[PDB]
Structure formats: C-alpha cells, structure tokens
Amino acid sequence: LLRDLERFELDKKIAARVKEQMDQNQREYYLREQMKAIQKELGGGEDFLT
Amino acid sequence: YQQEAVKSTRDPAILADLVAHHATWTLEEKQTILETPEVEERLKRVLAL
C-alpha cells in the first residue's frame, strides 16, 4: 500500500503537469479564435478591412 | 474514444494513431504526427496541440 501511494502520487503529479499543459493552451486559443471569427464573419472580403 | 483508450488498446503506436486520426487537422501537422518514430515525442506533440 505504500507502493500504491507512491504510484498514485507519481501518476497525479505528472498528470497535474499535463493538466497545466493544456490549461495554458486553452486560454491561448480562447485568445486566438474569436478575433479571426469576428473579422471573418463580419462582411468578409467585401467588408473592406484591406 | 473509450474503445480507443488504454482499457482496450495497449500499444502506444496504435493508440497514438487512434487519438490522432479523430480530429480534422492541417496537412503538415498530420505529417508531423506521421514522421516521428519516438513514442514520447509524438505523444507530447499531440498533448501540446
């Protein structure tokens, strides 16, 4: 059971590292998606953003 | 996705293919899945992106 506690801690620490690894990138793509969404969906090429 | 998880697939190459096929990627990043012979490098690649 001490081996099981060490196994669960070594699972959970690196799993929390992977949880941080996509929790950073989720907020990054939250910042990425919506600007290209709104100045793609507003008018388009005839919206003269050029 | 639970049939393509650890509970039914044990080989990380086959499980990496079954994770990486079930999205609609871009073509060059599908090639960076396909190019890598290392298990850990392509798994950290798909975990990153």
mmCIF file of C-alpha atoms in Angstrom:
data_model
loop_
_atom_site.group_PDB
_atom_site.id
_atom_site.type_symbol
_atom_site.label_atom_id
_atom_site.label_comp_id
_atom_site.label_asym_id
_atom_site.label_seq_id
_atom_site.Cartn_x
_atom_site.Cartn_y
_atom_site.Cartn_z
ATOM 1 C CA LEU A 1 0.000 0.000 0.000
ATOM 2 C CA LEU A 2 3.000 2.331 0.410
ATOM 3 C CA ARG A 3 3.953 1.280 -3.145
ATOM 4 C CA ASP A 4 0.375 2.098 -4.238
ATOM 5 C CA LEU A 5 0.554 5.539 -2.570
ATOM 6 C CA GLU A 6 3.871 6.247 -4.340
ATOM 7 C CA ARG A 7 2.350 5.027 -7.644
ATOM 8 C CA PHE A 8 -0.713 7.281 -7.231
ATOM 9 C CA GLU A 9 1.459 10.305 -6.329
ATOM 10 C CA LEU A 10 3.735 9.720 -9.349
ATOM 11 C CA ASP A 11 0.616 9.438 -11.515
ATOM 12 C CA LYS A 12 -1.079 12.553 -10.106
ATOM 13 C CA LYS A 13 1.923 14.941 -10.168
ATOM 14 C CA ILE A 14 2.768 14.429 -13.852
ATOM 15 C CA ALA A 15 -0.988 14.312 -14.644
ATOM 16 C CA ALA A 16 -1.351 17.745 -12.996
ATOM 17 C CA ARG A 17 1.597 18.904 -15.141
ATOM 18 C CA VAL A 18 -0.283 17.709 -18.270
ATOM 19 C CA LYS A 19 -3.424 19.450 -16.888
ATOM 20 C CA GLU A 20 -1.425 22.702 -16.715
ATOM 21 C CA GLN A 21 -0.066 21.946 -20.227
ATOM 22 C CA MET A 22 -3.477 22.102 -21.883
ATOM 23 C CA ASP A 23 -4.943 24.624 -19.404
ATOM 24 C CA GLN A 24 -2.432 27.205 -20.651
ATOM 25 C CA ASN A 25 -3.167 26.435 -24.314
ATOM 26 C CA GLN A 26 -6.958 26.504 -23.782
ATOM 27 C CA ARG A 27 -6.738 30.161 -22.713
ATOM 28 C CA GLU A 28 -4.255 30.810 -25.557
ATOM 29 C CA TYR A 29 -6.701 29.508 -28.165
ATOM 30 C CA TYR A 30 -9.508 31.375 -26.364
ATOM 31 C CA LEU A 31 -7.472 34.469 -27.215
ATOM 32 C CA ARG A 32 -6.792 33.120 -30.727
ATOM 33 C CA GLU A 33 -10.202 32.077 -32.098
ATOM 34 C CA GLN A 34 -12.589 34.982 -31.660
ATOM 35 C CA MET A 35 -10.814 37.844 -33.470
ATOM 36 C CA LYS A 36 -10.417 35.770 -36.643
ATOM 37 C CA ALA A 37 -14.021 34.606 -36.116
ATOM 38 C CA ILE A 38 -15.480 38.120 -35.857
ATOM 39 C CA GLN A 39 -13.478 39.731 -38.693
ATOM 40 C CA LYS A 40 -14.131 36.719 -40.825
ATOM 41 C CA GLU A 41 -17.889 36.692 -40.147
ATOM 42 C CA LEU A 42 -18.376 40.479 -40.380
ATOM 43 C CA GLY A 43 -18.898 41.012 -44.105
ATOM 44 C CA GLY A 44 -15.857 39.167 -45.459
ATOM 45 C CA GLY A 45 -13.795 40.358 -48.410
ATOM 46 C CA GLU A 46 -16.417 42.997 -49.271
ATOM 47 C CA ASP A 47 -16.133 44.438 -45.728
ATOM 48 C CA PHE A 48 -13.002 46.419 -46.979
ATOM 49 C CA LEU A 49 -10.804 45.625 -43.997
ATOM 50 C CA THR A 50 -7.950 45.820 -46.550
ATOM 51 C CA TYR B 1 -12.964 7.055 -27.670
ATOM 52 C CA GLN B 2 -13.169 4.723 -24.664
ATOM 53 C CA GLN B 3 -12.704 1.779 -27.043
ATOM 54 C CA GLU B 4 -9.579 3.564 -28.347
ATOM 55 C CA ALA B 5 -8.288 4.300 -24.827
ATOM 56 C CA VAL B 6 -5.864 2.380 -22.571
ATOM 57 C CA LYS B 7 -8.673 -0.025 -21.500
ATOM 58 C CA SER B 8 -8.824 -1.722 -24.933
ATOM 59 C CA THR B 9 -5.631 -0.593 -26.746
ATOM 60 C CA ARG B 10 -2.267 -1.263 -25.091
ATOM 61 C CA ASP B 11 0.194 -0.400 -27.897
ATOM 62 C CA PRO B 12 1.059 3.346 -27.749
ATOM 63 C CA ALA B 13 1.690 3.484 -31.519
ATOM 64 C CA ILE B 14 -1.814 2.179 -32.335
ATOM 65 C CA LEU B 15 -3.363 4.282 -29.548
ATOM 66 C CA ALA B 16 -1.419 7.350 -30.758
ATOM 67 C CA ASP B 17 -2.822 6.742 -34.258
ATOM 68 C CA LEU B 18 -6.363 6.328 -32.880
ATOM 69 C CA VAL B 19 -6.090 9.550 -30.844
ATOM 70 C CA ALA B 20 -4.508 11.482 -33.710
ATOM 71 C CA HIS B 21 -6.893 10.402 -36.501
ATOM 72 C CA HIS B 22 -10.154 11.500 -34.827
ATOM 73 C CA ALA B 23 -9.758 15.255 -35.409
ATOM 74 C CA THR B 24 -9.583 17.379 -38.574
ATOM 75 C CA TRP B 25 -6.050 18.725 -38.562
ATOM 76 C CA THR B 26 -3.917 20.555 -41.084
ATOM 77 C CA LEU B 27 -1.807 18.542 -43.502
ATOM 78 C CA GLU B 28 1.734 19.433 -42.361
ATOM 79 C CA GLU B 29 0.858 18.743 -38.732
ATOM 80 C CA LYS B 30 -0.571 15.348 -39.760
ATOM 81 C CA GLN B 31 2.861 14.825 -41.326
ATOM 82 C CA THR B 32 4.485 15.749 -38.003
ATOM 83 C CA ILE B 33 2.337 13.045 -36.393
ATOM 84 C CA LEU B 34 3.392 10.615 -39.116
ATOM 85 C CA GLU B 35 7.113 11.472 -39.222
ATOM 86 C CA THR B 36 8.014 10.825 -35.575
ATOM 87 C CA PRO B 37 9.305 7.322 -34.665
ATOM 88 C CA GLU B 38 9.543 8.208 -30.966
ATOM 89 C CA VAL B 39 6.514 7.372 -28.816
ATOM 90 C CA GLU B 40 7.079 10.178 -26.276
ATOM 91 C CA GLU B 41 7.781 12.919 -28.846
ATOM 92 C CA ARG B 42 4.591 12.320 -30.857
ATOM 93 C CA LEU B 43 2.569 11.876 -27.647
ATOM 94 C CA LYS B 44 3.882 15.192 -26.289
ATOM 95 C CA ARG B 45 3.150 16.683 -29.738
ATOM 96 C CA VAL B 46 -0.490 15.571 -29.666
ATOM 97 C CA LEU B 47 -0.760 16.554 -25.964
ATOM 98 C CA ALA B 48 0.536 20.016 -26.872
ATOM 99 C CA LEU B 49 -1.653 20.605 -29.916
#
